[PDB]
Amino acid sequence: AGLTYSQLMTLKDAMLQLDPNAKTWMDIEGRPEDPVEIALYQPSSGCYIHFFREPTDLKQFKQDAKYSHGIDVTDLFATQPGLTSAVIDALPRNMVITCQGSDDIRKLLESQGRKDIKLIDIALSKTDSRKYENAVWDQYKDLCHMHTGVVVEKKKEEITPHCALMDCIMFDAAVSGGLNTSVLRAVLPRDMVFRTSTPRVVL
Ligand SMILES: [Zn+2]
DSSP states (O other), rough: OOOHHHHHHHHHHTTTTSTSSSSHHHHHHOOOTOOSEEEEEOTTOOOEEEEEOOOSHHHHHHHHHTTOOOOOOGGGGBTTTTHHHHHHHOTTOOOOEEESSHHHHHHHHHTTTTTOOEEEEEEHHHHTTTTHHHHHHHHHHOOOOOOSOOEOOOOEEEEEEOOOOHHHHHHHTTTTTTOOOOOOSSSSOHHHBOOOOOOOOOO
């Protein structure tokens, strides 16, 4: 499938707010060859890109749900196909992107022809990166309700589910001494994130 020419031009419209000279975090949930949640975050401006994708490898998705994102696969059946490839194509040229663990972000961008994107690796330890975790969830819990399952960590203690958006927000908080003052606003309209079908009309 893919996005129509009108959607691609609308996506091109929404991508203009991103300041290409501002700090931009990027995190994904799921493997880079088969991602299911993608998030970009500019803390200075408050603009964030957030959308989902149906997985190709169902066997690996179940493992990632048990030990990371805890997403029910049935909640990803109405996503817009091809949005990931289109958003990556529409990112500004030679944009610099910040991430905790730059390996998987680099693989996703190179697999989509965007070798021009510069990446900076913030190497924070596992428990250091998620110090603001409870504070980020309490402030922006209404921005993602997709994480419904119980996530555990092998040696089987239950943990908070990993969200691509909340990760970008809490990672920037760890290197900035706290949450940014800017209020978040979504770059992408909801009609492009979820392929919504016409419901039955009550006559
Ligand atoms: Zn999420």
